[PDB]
Design goal:
monomer, alpha/beta, Alkaline Phosphatase, subunit A, Alpha-Beta Plaits, 2 domains, 7-stranded mixed sheet, 6-stranded mixed sheet, 14 helices, binds manganese (II) ion, isomerase
Length: 391
């Protein structure tokens, strides 16, 4: 192998400006890093700058450097959709024609009618809401009636809440499996069904850790599958295992925050492994992008950047660091959905004694998968062109 270890970091939703096909999505004018930089009167990201972030694109507080530590470019999404699954699945070598849908006005009556028909239960709610909000509003009615609270987030999810003392957990799980079956339909294609059991009394409801998820497997065997099948380590950090439904994962490390994510990345740097360490930093998307909070997003990016020098110090000559994103989620954009954007790509190894250069623009996210596959000598993905030789 050229590199013994590849550390892949997805800064979730950290887009670098509208893609050529942004108009189709209602995403004209969308710039995630750029609008955040303007809100902050200049972003403080000196370590990303040293890597060459400004060399990809100059933004307020983010300037180009004469000698970037590593190679740099941006990537264009080839798949139809801009959702959580699509971006990650493409990164690992796939092409996804069928997008996962979001439901800002709730689910179609046709879907909910069939769920009622199959379960013999009434459905209430049917709106985007946080767990706390929907239980405060509907928890009591749910307890008294034995109905199901169905709700969604700003991402492609269908969540079903029921009180543990009113609907047995095993019955809730059975209902979620039915919902999972009904939502494998492009009429209303849902990424994830989530059981949301709760306990307590009116005015004091709490969700329990008895949450179960019902996810879809990637539409194809991924580069992670190939690595695992060839006895390489595939260490998933954060939501990565969930996103791929465990496919090709050899170890999964749960994280509770972006800072915790970086701690787990550092943990993997300290591990003797051969293969891929794959981190998703989700706070950018989950806390700040969807909530249209440019201040919080900017603070999070600055907190993330400050962690990087320790990562640089720990990288070995035969380690490669790859930093990218999955889509955009511009915190100063209408609505609550993602934005169709280019994503940055930074590729750094301490063995790059002369620093890096500009790479040709990556025409699909699958170029990452192709590079990883070529490095470890496993079956190449159907899509994607490796840039390993350029490094
Ligand atoms: Mn838009
Ligand atoms: Mn994402
Ligand atoms: Mn999202
Ligand atoms: Mn050196
Ligand atoms: Mn390309």
């Amino acid at each position: 192998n050229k590199y013994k270890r590849i550390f892949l970091v997805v800064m979730d939703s950290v887009g670098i400006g509208e893609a050529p096909d942004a108009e189709q999505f209602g995403d004209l004018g969308s710039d995630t890093i750029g609008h955040i930089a303007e809100h902050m009167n200049g972003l403080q990201m000196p370590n990303m700058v040293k890597l060459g972030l400004g060399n990809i694109r100059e933004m307020k507080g983010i300037s180009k450097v004469e000698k970037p530590l590593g190679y740099y470019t941006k990537m264009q999404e080839k798949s139809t959709g801009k959702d959580e699954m699509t971006g990650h699945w493409e990164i690992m070598g796939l092409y996804i024609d069928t997008p996962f849908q979001v439901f800002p006005e709730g689910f179609p009556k046709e879907l909910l009618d069939e769920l009622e028909e199959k379960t013999g239960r009434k459905i209430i709610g049917n709106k985007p809401a946080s767990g706390t909000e929907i239980l405060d509003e509907l928890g009591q009615e749910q307890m008294e009636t034995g109905s199901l609270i169905v709700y969604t987030s700003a991402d492609s999810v269908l969540q079903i809440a029921a009180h543990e003392e009113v609907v047995p957990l095993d019955e809730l799980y059975k209902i979620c499996k039915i919902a999972r079956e009904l939502t494998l339909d492009e009429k209303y294609m849902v990424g994830r069904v989530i059981a949301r059991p709760f306990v307590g009394e009116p005015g004091n409801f709490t969700r329990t850790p008895n949450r179960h998820d019902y996810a879809l497997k990637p539409f194809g065997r991924t580069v992670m599958n190939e690595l695992k099948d060839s006895d390489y380590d595939v260490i998933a950090i954060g939501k990565i295992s969930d996103i791929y439904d465990g496919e090709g994962v050899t170890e999964s490390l749960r994280t509770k925050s972006n800072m915790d994510g970086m701690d787990k990345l550092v943990d993997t740097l300290n591990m003797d492994f051969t293969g891929l360490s794959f981190l998703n930093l989700v706070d950018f998307d989950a806390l700040f992008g969807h909530r249209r909070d440019p201040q919080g997003y900017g603070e999070a990016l600055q907190e993330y950047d400050a962690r990087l020098p320790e990562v640089f110090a720990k990288l070995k000559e035969d380690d490669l660091l790859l930093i990218t994103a999955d889509h955009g989620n511009d915190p100063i954009h209408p609505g609550t959905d993602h934005t169709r954007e280019y994503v940055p790509l930074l590729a750094y190894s301490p063995s790059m004694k002369e620093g890096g250069q500009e790479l040709p623009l990556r025409q699909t996210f699958a170029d990452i998968g192709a590079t990883v596959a070529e490095n470890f000598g496993v079956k190449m993905p159907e899509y994607g062109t490796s840039f390993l030789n350029e490094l």
